[PDB]
Design a protein around this nucleic acid. Structure first.
Lengths: 100, 150, 941, 79, 122, 116, 95, 112, 108
RNA sequence: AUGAUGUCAUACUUAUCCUGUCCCUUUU
């Protein structure tokens, strides 16, 4: 996105697990990364939500509280009918901040 | 078939004093200290003091017939590996003035040799605080020796 | 002491294996000799030439000093016993030395000299020696200022293809191998290894093992982030190199004497198998576990099966059958380890085996159950682990019998001192007794008394894993046998001395009353409850949520059964609300915050008077960490009792809040801004406008916050008060900012311009903004461009009009003064383009697309991705046909650049709306070998 | 049988997985065959377009559908 | 797993020392009223007299008994010894836990259940 | 710190020409990189208009060579006397001149040394 | 090369190919290992194996020059076993 | 070396910061002090390089204080120069007492 | 009673280009018998040397007393030399003959 | 008179981000 250009999404097969968002990343969109116009809910992959991988945020990856949703600008642009956008990789973000 | 004994095992004693390739016996007490008196080992095997070893610079000194345990070998075939151990330690004694204090003096005690030892043509028994001084005619072997130290 | 064998690892196929055979044979020679009878073993001149690097001589001096060195041993005893001493004379008295010789050259630790000595000498400017010499940019990465580390890091990234992997790793692996290595320095060298391994692909093949030897110790580590990094870089290495490279590389470490390398090597195969997939690597494994040489191998390979189970986890599912078919042959093996680790690996499998593939484990069972009878010690517990994870996967009929058999041993084995044991049998009790096909009364009688006897003790709780797992198991037993039982037995322990134990039973009660509900609880036990919870809460050694969330959940679960207990509660709440200054104030405050609703619905109004004015009084507290909790409590009190009923009428409260905003720190800033938000949104009439506009001019600099949520609440509030007043003044006060501060929140003011433009119709506001683009100051020009962007993003449909107004200005902006204009303006075109869709304004969007179109070419990431979003929105709004009519000629153009880009675009147009493209592909004539005319469209009735 | 050609991966990038997107180095015949296959798929998917195509010709709907499915592989001759 | 028990006991003692626990809840209320401590992981060349001499630094042991196995010298590696008071057992579990004695390290913990012949893990 | 870039040096020269010389706090409020003492030291070291930054001759070298032996320390005292007055060009010239030119019984003895 | 003809391991035996593969592995790698025998067992376990994948797996393990000759010797013996109606190579008819 | 540097920096900190006052010069002094207490070997490197190299000095500060009987003027120095000179001073006194160079005549020292 | 990272090899620097191996052997020969010593004869490595002793504790007493020890005008850089790094220039081989010997002579 | 590589400051963007830990390495 915005917060991270080197991050890669999962884009796996869509399952029946509804996605969730963390308390620090509440209200933020997954594709458009906006805060207004939520139109479609976020669905997670089957391998992305299993055991300890269930109930986690898609973007933040932390403890999810509320369910995540997609932006209406991404819904009208057909950017929400793609695969599961689970953040798998984590590069150049929250790595040197742990040392300080 | 069982026979547990709960006695003193050798491994706990060997782990406390562990040498390079053998066990280490004849440990000094806690009252050992570095000597500051004017004393040097003058060895005369053929009335000529070729070598000279400082006894106040080192804390431990082991001489034997083995090259792996000892640091420097010795040319004495009639002496065992553990025959005599001359170590300096400040023991409880009185000076000439009568005041008590710490005096650096050498300790003389037999370590249980197989043939014993002799000093100034006289055998000395262990566990007896003998007045050891400089220029003593000692023997560094179990039976006899052709070399004396001063 | 186990891990420090790392320090003994020297740096780095038939020859490779030939070496291990000789290594083990020398081990048998030496080991044998002692029976026949370390690093100090004497050495040989070839071995001597082996250690030191290139360019040194072993030339001696005279023929009378080497004999001194030989007598030195004998004379180390002899001459130490001889005359010697040193002295000094008083006499009057050149001093050379070297720090790092360079323009700056950030400093060298006294040890690192050994590595970087070559840099110290100043000889310069006369091939490879100059590449090693210039490669000391490493030193700039290791030690120096952060900017030096950044710039150095890039410079070495782009020189990868140049220098090659050989010199780099040759000059790195010693450093990453250094005994004095830091935490940070380690991590940074890991970073450079990654970044260079994103490029080098075929090159690394000789160095792969030479890498892994240092890296595999990262997999076993106390730090977690170190582990995820390690797994990542081994993933990049294995995928980077070839499969056969990895395989053929890593064999000799399987039979290596030390088990350390075997283990970490197993996790290595786990990572590489995640990289290149299970089926590719299967025949290797399946070959390994059947190796007839020695057991250690099979032990390793089985451990590999396990670590694959942990790593891949849920994704094992397809090959589960083949994997089982591999592992099954080790359960019956004569060696023990292989059996143990085997069944353990079955466990890991089944645990990653989500409710399915039961029959794949099928043939495994019948031996296991049999083994359950005859085993003593750890292997037994391991089997219990496996069977434990299995049982949820069986049928409640077969698992009825089998379960009822397991329960016996499960009972008998509670009492073992082994903590591994207790972990296993614990989680077991969870799965076996958390089965729907198990009867309550049987558990109530047989299990619970020994369970609370042996398991609940102060050995457990002090440990971490045992703590958690215990919590879970107890929670589930509550889930079956019911609530009042478990709680009723563990209440008396709330009053126990130690903290951690109290914490444990407290969180247990919390989760229990969370799930089952408080309805089951009787009266007396409820008295013991509330008293227990107060008592435990009155002594807090550390600050933590467990006690608080615990209390809150207990009360909210009890509902209004708690009402008789309030005066005791809140009495404690006020008295504690003094006592501890910095420690407990914040905590009692938060207690109020979470108990608000309960103190409301039961209609105790005196208590709301109390909390209202009492808390009102603490707003002068100088300690921020307290004050924050105070404001939070006020917040929660606002959400229960309404505006006009506030016992501290808002006229009092709000201006008393206003000065606090200088607090800066989020602790007071967070809750404060929040509350100003709640009141500013809800009532908002109680306060006169003058106060409000002052609040504005105070809010303006809150945008320096380092936290995102602060700015969040801030902007939303600013919208609320924008409603309370009306647009023009406040949007002017936003335009007062020239966006000089690029740090903290700047564009945030832009967002305020957006939301303000929403709160009352932007149909009013736009002319002011559009006029304010005139100002010659550039950064605020791009600022108002952003304001348009977010503006259309929030307004959506309503832009069906204002498009025209913004159109010529976008013309001026999109026509480039400087790149940021084109970028931001393009984003505006995007959000406009999504917003207006389908309403028939496309024409002017085409006009703007003209000026958009030249910007297609550039290497700047933000402008190219911006333009991409732009042309995507323009795709959906205009329709593909026009897009494609701009994208045709660029596809086949001779240059590489144009083709790269126009094909990127054409792909973006292609993926979406691929169905609607059909009509618009032009007519393309047919050549000799191929017919390029689609004649179907030319069929005419 | 040394081939020295292992199109496996590099740095988890590119790796085309879709069909009909195309590249910058795409030939004219491959793009024409992909456009013809997309046109055949759009004719087979749309019911009104298939009805308008079968009403003009004297063939039936299922025969024209089988002819369009048979002409998909080699519908214009791979370049 | 074989040597992780002493590490787990040391981690529990470190967590009890760092969590701010008093003397009443310092992992002693669950192993109270019993001076019988469980020792496991000893060397195969250690006798009962040497273990009784090494474990007498914190007080005189009342009843010590080594795990008898392999009819030749009764050697299995485990040992059970009851001290005089519970404070001596607490000091032995707090000081002699995880220490090294003649090569391989041993483990010191409390059982406080009964006297059983086969209760440790080899 | 104190990198003394050229764009900062021009701004410091403009602040010295516009504001004044005996007002160091007024010149430090328009640079955002150095303090007032560092700005005054830069103005007295490199930004001074009377500093002779070039033309090293043999008369000044002979003056500095005939002054470093009379006073070995206190190079700041010989800064304005030699004429350089930069307090660092004198030490650099001394280092260049040192590197380029490098490339009772006792009395009884001497008494008999003349009598023999 | 010789790895372009399609073959099938279901029409050929497996016990007669173990000694020739063991001799080829002892000639190539010098000694006898357990990873190469397991790789040869996994390469013939499928009913329709891949000659190019087996050649890549042999070039990754061995040097490549001897691995190409080993693949060319294993493809011809498998072809002679699959072409025969019995399902055995030419080295099994004599002994 | 390091033991002497810690002692001298402790004295310099205890004097220059006591309680809740500042400047901007004193702020840079406290900051360099904290950086020295964070990366001590680098600071010892800095001090050694300065003491062997830089034979110059920056402009020191002075304004007298008035114990109104006899005024006794008190001089102030620039920060990093003060730190380096302070480690030099504690070094000089350490080697002086180890050498017993100043006699027992000049008796102002560590009896009381 | 020793840190593990120290090894029998010591990297020694701040050496003159004229320095003699006589002074080398003499000085360093205090602590124990020399396994051997190398000296850089190459343009970059001139001024550096590596010392190797029959025992580690030798080297420990060495770096103890020889820390910042003086020669000519110089204070030598005395560090414990690292391991691994650049090794594989040589190989693992020639184990077969010696192992065959110990398998022959003692017969074990 | 553009453009080229190059050591070196300076602004700008990413609504970039400040409580992250071993709740999993337990390898002889």
């Amino acid at each position: 996105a915005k917060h991270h250009p080197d991050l890669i999404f999962c884009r796996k097969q869509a399952g029946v697990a509804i996605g969730r968002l963390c308390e620090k990343c509440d209200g933020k969109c997954v594709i458009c990364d906006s805060y207004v116009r939520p139109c479609t809910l976020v669905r997670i992959c089957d391998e992305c939500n299993y055991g300890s991988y269930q109930g986690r945020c898609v973007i933040c990856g932390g403890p999810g509280v509320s369910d995540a949703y997609y932006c209406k600008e991404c819904t009208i642009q057909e950017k929400d009918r793609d695969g599961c956008p689970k953040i798998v990789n984590l590069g150049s973000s929250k790595t040197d901040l742990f040392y300080e | 078939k069982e026979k547990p004994s709960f006695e003193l095992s050798g491994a706990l004693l060997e782990d406390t004093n562990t040498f390079r390739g053998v066990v280490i016996k004849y440990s000094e007490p806690p009252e050992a200290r570095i000597p500051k008196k004017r004393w040097r080992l003058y060895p005369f095997k053929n009335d000529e003091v070729l070598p000279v070893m400082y006894i106040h610079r080192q804390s431990a000194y082991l001489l034997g017939r083995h090259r792996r345990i000892a640091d420097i070998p010795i040319d004495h075939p009639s002496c065992s590996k553990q025959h005599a151990v001359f170590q300096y330690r400040l023991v409880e004694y009185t000076r000439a003035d009568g005041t008590v204090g710490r005096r650096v003096k050498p300790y003389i005690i037999d370590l249980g040799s197989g043939n014993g030892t002799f000093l100034n043509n006289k055998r000395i028994e262990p566990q007896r605080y003998y007045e050891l001084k400089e220029k003593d005619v000692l023997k560094f072997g179990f039976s006899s020796r052709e070399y004396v130290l001063l | 002491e186990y891990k420090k064998h790392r320090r003994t690892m020297i740096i780095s196929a038939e020859t490779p294996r030939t070496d291990r055979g000789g290594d083990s044979i020398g081990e048998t020679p030496t080991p044998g000799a002692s029976k026949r009878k370390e690093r100090n073993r004497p050495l040989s001149d070839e071995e001597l030439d082996a250690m030191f690097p290139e360019g040194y001589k072993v030339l001696p001096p005279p023929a009378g000093y080497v004999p001194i060195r030989t007598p030195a041993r004998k004379l180390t005893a002899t001459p130490t016993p001889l005359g010697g001493m040193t002295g000094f004379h008083m006499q009057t008295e050149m001093k050379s030395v070297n720090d790092q010789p360079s323009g700056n050259l950030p400093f060298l630790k006294p040890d690192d000299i050994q590595y970087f000595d070559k840099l110290l000498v100043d000889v310069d400017e006369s091939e490879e020696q100059k590449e090693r010499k210039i490669m000391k940019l490493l030193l700039k990465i290791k030690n120096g200022t952060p900017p030096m580390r950044k710039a150095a890091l890039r410079q070495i990234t782009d020189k990868a293809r140049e220098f090659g992997a050989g010199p780099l790793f040759n000059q790195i692996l010693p450093l990453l191998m250094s005994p004095t290595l830091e935490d940070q320095e380690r991590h940074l060298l890991v970073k450079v290894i990654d970044r260079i391994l994103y490029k080098l692909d075929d090159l690394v093949r000789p160095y792969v093992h030479k890498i892994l030897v240092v890296i595999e110790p990262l997999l076993i580590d106390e730090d977690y982030y170190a582990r995820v990094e390690g797994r990542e870089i081994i993933s990049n290495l294995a995928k980077a190199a070839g499969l056969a490279t990895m395989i053929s590389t890593m064999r000799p470490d399987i039979d290596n004497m030390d088990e350390y390398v075997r283990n970490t090597t197993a996790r290595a195969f786990a990572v590489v198998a995640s990289a290149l997939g299970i089926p590719s690597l299967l025949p290797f494994l399946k070959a390994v576990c059947k190796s007839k040489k020695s057991w250690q191998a099979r032990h390793t390979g089985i451990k590999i099966v396990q670590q694959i189970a942990i790593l891949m986890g849920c994704a094992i599912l397809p090959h589960l059958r083949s994997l089982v078919e591999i592992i099954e042959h080790g359960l019956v093996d004569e060696q023990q380890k292989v059996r143990t680790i085997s069944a353990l690996a079955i466990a890991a499998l089944a645990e990653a085996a989500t409710p399915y593939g039961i029959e794949s484990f099928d043939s495994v069972l019948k031996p296991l159950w049999k083994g359950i009878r005859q085993h003593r010690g750890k292997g037994l517990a391991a089997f219990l682990k496996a069977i434990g994870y299995l049982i949820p996967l069986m049928d409640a009929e077969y698992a009825n019998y089998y379960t009822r058999e397991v329960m016996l041993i499960l009972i008998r084995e509670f009492q073992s001192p082994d903590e591994e044991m207790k972990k296993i049998v614990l989680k077991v009790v969870k799965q076996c007794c958390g089965t729907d096909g198990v009867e309550a009364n049987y558990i109530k009688t047989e299990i619970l008394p020994p369970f609370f006897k042996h398991f609940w003790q102060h050995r457990m709780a002090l440990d971490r894993r045992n703590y958690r797992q215990l919590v879970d198991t107890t929670v589930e037993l509550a889930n079956k046998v019911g609530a009042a039982e478990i709680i009723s037995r563990i209440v008396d322990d709330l009053k126990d001395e130690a903290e951690q134990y109290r914490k444990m039973v407290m969180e247990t009660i919390e989760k229990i009353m969370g799930n089952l509900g408080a309805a089951d609880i009787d009266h007396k036990l409820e008295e013991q409850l509330i008293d227990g919870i107060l008592y435990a809460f009155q002594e807090q050694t550390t600050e933590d949520s467990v006690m608080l969330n615990g209390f809150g959940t207990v009360v909210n679960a009890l509902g209004k059964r708690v009402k008789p207990y309030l005066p005791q509660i809140c009495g404690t709440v006020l008295w504690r609300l003094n006592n501890k200054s910095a420690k407990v104030r914040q905590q009692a405050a938060d207690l109020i915050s979470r108990t608000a609703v309960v103190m409301k619905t039961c209609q105790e109004e005196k208590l709301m008077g109390h909390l209202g004015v009492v808390l009102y009084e603490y707003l002068g507290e100088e300690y921020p960490e307290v004050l924050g909790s105070i404001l939070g409590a006020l917040k929660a009190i606002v959400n229960v009792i309404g505006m006009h009923k506030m016992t501290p009428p808002i006229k009092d409260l709000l201006p008393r809040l206003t000065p606090i905003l200088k607090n800066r720190h989020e602790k007071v800033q967070e809750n404060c801004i929040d509350l100003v938000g709640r009141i500013a949104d809800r009532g908002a009439e109680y306060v006169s406008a003058r106060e409000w506009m002052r609040i504005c001019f105070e809010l303006l600099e809150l945008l320096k916050a380092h936290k995102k949520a602060i700015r969040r609440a801030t902007v939303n509030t600013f919208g609320y008060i924008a409603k309370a007043i009306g647009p023009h003044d406040v949007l002017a006060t936003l335009l007062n900012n020239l966006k000089v501060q690029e740090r903290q929140n700047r564009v945030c003011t832009t967002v305020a311009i957006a939301i303000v433009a929403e709160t009352c119709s932007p149909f009013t506001v736009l002319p002011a903004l559009m006029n304010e683009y005139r100002v010659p100051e550039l950064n605020v020009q791009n600022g108002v461009l952003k304001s348009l962007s977010f503006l259309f993003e929030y307004i959506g449909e309503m832009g069906k009009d204002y498009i025209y107004a913004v159109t010529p200005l976008l013309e001026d902006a999109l026509m480039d003064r400087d790149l940021v204009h084109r970028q931001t303006a393009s984003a505006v075109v995007q959000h406009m383009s999504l917003g207006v869709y389908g309403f028939g304004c496309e024409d002017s969007l085409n006009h703007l697309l003209n000026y958009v179109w030249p910007n297609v070419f550039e290497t700047s990431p933000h402008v190219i991705q911006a333009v991409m979003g732009a042309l995507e929105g323009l795709r959906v709004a205009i329709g593909p046909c026009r897009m494609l009519q701009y994208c045709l000629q660029g596809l086949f153009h001779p240059a590489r650049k144009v083709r790269d880009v126009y094909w990127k675009i054409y792909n973006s147009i292609y993926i979406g709306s691929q169905d609607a493209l059909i009509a618009h592909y032009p007519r393309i004539y047919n050549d000799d070998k191929n017919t390029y005319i689609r004649y179907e469209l030319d069929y005419i009735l | 049988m040394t081939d020295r050609y292992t199109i496996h991966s590099q740095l988890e990038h590119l790796q085309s997985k879709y069909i009909g997107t195309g590249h910058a180095d795409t030939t004219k015949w491959e793009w024409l065959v992909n456009q013809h296959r997309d046109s055949y798929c759009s004719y087979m998917g749309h019911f009104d377009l298939l009805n308008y195509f079968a009403i003009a010709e004297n063939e039936s709907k299922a025969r024209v559908r089988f002819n369009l499915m048979e002409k998909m592989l080699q519908p214009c001759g791979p370049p | 797993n074989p040597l992780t028990k002493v590490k787990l006991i040391n981690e529990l003692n470190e967590r009890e020392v760092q969590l701010g626990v008093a003397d009443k809840v310092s992992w002693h209320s669950e192993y109270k009223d019993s001076a019988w401590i469980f020792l496991g992981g000893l060397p195969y060349e250690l006798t009962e007299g040497d273990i009784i001499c090494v474990f007498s630094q914190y007080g005189e042991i009342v009843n010590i008994n080594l795990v008898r196995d392999k009819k030749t010298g009764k050697s299995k590696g485990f040992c059970f010894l009851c001290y005089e008071d519970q404070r001596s057992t607490i000091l032995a579990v707090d000081n002699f836990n995880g220490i090294k004695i003649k090569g391989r390290t041993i483990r010191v913990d409390h059982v406080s259940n009964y006297r059983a012949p086969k209760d440790s893990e080899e | 710190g104190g990198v003394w870039r050229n764009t900062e040096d021009e701004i410091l020269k403009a602040a010295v020409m516009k504001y004044g010389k005996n007002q160091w706090s007024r010149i430090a409020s328009l640079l955002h990189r150095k303090s007032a003492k560092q700005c005054k030291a830069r103005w007295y070291e490199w930004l001074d208009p009377s500093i002779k930054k070039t033309e090293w001759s043999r008369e000044e070298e002979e003056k500095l060579l005939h002054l470093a032996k009379l006073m070995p320390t206190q190079w700041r005292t010989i800064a304005p006397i030699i004429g350089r007055t930069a307090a660092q060009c004198l030490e650099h010239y001394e280092f260049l001149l040192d590197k380029a030119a490098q490339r009772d019984e006792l009395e009884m003895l001497s008494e008999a040394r003349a009598r023999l | 090369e010789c790895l372009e003809k399609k073959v099938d391991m279901s029409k050929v035996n497996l016990e007669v190919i173990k000694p020739w593969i063991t001799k080829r592995v002892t000639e190539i790698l010098g000694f006898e290992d357990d990873v190469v025998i397991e790789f040869i067992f996994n390469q013939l376990e499928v009913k329709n194996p891949d000659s190019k994948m087996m050649q890549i797996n042999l070039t990754g393990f061995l040097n490549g020059k001897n691995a190409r000759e080993f693949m060319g010797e294993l493809w011809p013996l498998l072809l002679s076993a699959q072409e025969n109606i019995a399902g055995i190579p030419s080295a099994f008819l004599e002994l | 070396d390091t033991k002497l540097l810690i002692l001298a920096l402790e004295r310099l900190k205890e004097a220059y910061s006591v309680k809740s006052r500042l400047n901007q010069s004193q702020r840079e002094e406290l900051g360099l002090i904290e950086q020295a207490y964070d990366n001590p070997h680098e600071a010892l490197s800095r001090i050694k390089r300065h003491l062997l190299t830089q034979r110059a000095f920056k402009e020191v500060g002075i304004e007298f204080m008035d114990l109104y009987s006899h005024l006794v003027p008190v001089y102030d120095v620039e920060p990093l120069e003060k730190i380096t000179d302070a480690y030099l001073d504690q070094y000089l006194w350490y080697e002086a007492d180890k050498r017993r160079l100043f006699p027992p005549w000049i008796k102002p020292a560590d009896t009381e | 009673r020793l840190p593990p990272e120290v090894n029998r090899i010591l990297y020694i620097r701040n050496l003159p280009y004229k320095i003699t191996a006589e002074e080398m052997y003499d000085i360093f020969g205090k602590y124990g018998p020399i396994r051997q010593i190398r000296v850089g004869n190459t343009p970059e490595t001139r001024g550096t040397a590596y010392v190797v002793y029959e025992d580690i504790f030798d080297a420990k007493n060495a770096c103890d007393h020889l820390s910042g020890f003086n020669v000519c005008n110089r204070y030598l850089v005395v560090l414990y030399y690292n391991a691994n790094r650049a090794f594989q220039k040589m190989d693992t081989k020639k184990k077969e003959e010696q192992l065959k010997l110990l398998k022959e002579k003692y017969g074990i």
